[PDB]
C-alpha cells in the first residue's frame, strides 16, 4: 500500500505503523545448526544469524524471519522431527538445510517458476516415502512441512482434548469408585438398603475425612518433623527396652 | 528375481567394524516377499516382515535379539539435459547417466561411482512378485550399488536431439520502452518485466534449422490477422533479443492508423517546405511526447494491478496449498510448503463404488473422544 | 504468530509425555546394564540374576505403595504404628521403674 518496507501491528480495530531499517547482504552470517544443546527434544524453526548495522560495528544476534527480515528474539522453536528438509529465502537466493543442519546455497535461477496463474507443462512424479526406521522403533514424529489452515485447526482440537482429560482427573477422586460401589449395593436392597446405607455412608465419610486431615497436616515441614521425631523416639525406646529385657532373659 | 526371497542375514557397521545380523537370531533362510497393503496401483512395494503395519512392533523389538527385513520397491525416475544424473520418487539422487552402460555409445557417458559398483546383464527376464509369472521377452538390465541401497533399470540407447528452445507464450500486446541504456518489455498477460541490452541478437548464427524462426513468423501472422489487420500497420521486420534470466524474445513493432497519419502529414509538410515509417518512428518529438505519456500511463496501470493480484494469491497459497496448486496445474495434485518453496506430486483416482463409509464416529476405548470426519474402507 | 504458538504448545505436551512414560528406575537399570555389558561374560552371568532380585525390590515397594494410597490401607498402618508407639513408650517407662528400683 505504501510502496516501501514497513512494520505493522493491529491494536484492536485499527493499525499502527513504523519504518524498517535496511542492512547490507555482506554484513550477515548464518550458523550451521538448528539443534538446541541444552534441551535435546527441541529445535529452532528457522536458522540463527549474526550481523552488523555498519561495516565496523559490533555483532548482534538474531533469527532469520520471512522475506529477508532479521528478528532479534530467537523464540521460534519446535519439537525435533525425522526426515526434515527446508529452503529459506536468503539475500536474493536460498539456503538448504536437512536434518536440522546446513548443506549449501542456491541462486533464484536454480528453481523453476510458476510464472502465471495457469500453466500445464509441469512434469511431476508419483512420490513414494522412504520412511526412517525410528518412526516404528522409537515412535518419533515424521516431518510434514509448514502448517496449513486445516492442520492448524486439527492441532487446536487435539490440545483442547488433552486439557479436558486433565480436568477429569483433578475434578474426580479415588473415593468416587468406592461410593458408587456402595450405592449400587444398597439401592438393590430397598428399604433395608437405605436404612443401612444411610449410616454406612456416614461412617465411611468419617474415615476418609479423618485420614485426609492427618495426611494434610504432614504437608507443613513442622508437621512432617513432629511425626518424624515421634517415630524416631519410639524406635529408640523400643530397641532400648528390647535389649534390656534380653539382659533379664539372659540372667 | 529367481524365486522372490531374501537370505535372512545382513552385514552392518557398529563401533567402526563390520558385523553379521540374523533374523530372530536364526540360521540363513529364504524369506518370502509379501505385497504392501497400502501401496498404490503403480509404485508397488514388497516386504518380508509385517511390523511396518501390524501393532506388534510395540513389543517385538524387545522380544528378539535382532531383526532383518528385506524391501523391494518400484519407483518413477527423472533426468534432464545434459542427462548426467537422475532422481528417484523418494527424493534421492544418483550421480550417473541413465543412458550409461558397456554397449556402443553408452560407455562414454558421465559417472561418479567406482567401476565395481556397476554391472550390466543381457538377456534378463523379469518376474512379478505378485503373480509369480515370468516375462515373455528379454531386456538389458543395469545394476548399481549406492552406499544405502541397490538400484536397477532397463537400458536403452540415447534418444535423438531436439530444438534448443521451446515456445512459452504468444503475446498479443506488448509495450517496449527505452530507459537507463536498456530496453524494457511489459504486458497485461504476464506479470514479469523483461530487461535487455540495446543490441539485437543474430539468431541466424545459431538457428540453422529455423526451429525458432519459422514458428515465430507463423504466430505473429496469426495474431496480426485476428486482431490488428483492420486498425494497425507493421512498421518493419521482426527483431530478436536475449532477456535477463535466459529468455529469447521475438518482437514486431506496430503503429495504429490514427497515429500513422500524423507521421504522414509531418512528412508531407517536411517535403512541402523543401513511406518507410521505420525511419520516422522516433524523430518527431512533438508526436512522441503524447505517446510516451499515454503508453507510460497504461504500463503503470498494469503494474499496480499485478501487485494487487499477486498479494492476494500468495496469501491464499499458504492457507490451502492443494486447492491453489490444483487450479494452476489443471488437475488434482498434492502440495506442501518446504519453507519458502513448494513441493508437488500427483494424486491417484478411486472409483465411487469401491468406497464404504462406517455408521459411527464415537471411539469405544476412550469415552470422551470422537472422530472429526467419518471413517471409511 | 498463531502457528508459532501452536508449535510451542505441542512441544510442552511432548515434554510432559516424556516425563510420565519414563520412570526413576530407568536410570538405575541403565547404570547396571552399562556395568554388566562392560564386565563381559561374567557380567552377563551376574546381570541376569541381579535384574531379578532388583525387580523383586522395586515391585515390593510398588506393592505397598498401591496399598498405602487407599484410605483403609493408610488407616491400617496408622493404627498399627500408633499401637506400636504406645507399646514401646509403656514398656520403656516400665523398665525405667525396674532400672530405678
Automatic annotation (TrEMBL), chain C:
Spans traversing the lipid bilayer: 49-68, 74-95
Function per UniProt: Envelope glycoprotein that forms spikes at the surface of virion envelope and binds to the host cell entry receptors MYH9/NMMHC-IIA and MYH10/NMMHC-IIB, promoting the virus entry into host cells. Essential for the initial attachment to heparan sulfate moieties of the host cell surface proteoglycans. Involved in fusion of viral and cellular membranes leading to virus entry into the host cell: following initial binding to its host cell entry receptors, membrane fusion is mediated by the fusion machinery composed at least of gB and the heterodimer gH/gL.
Protein name: Glycoprotein B
Native species: Human herpesvirus 1
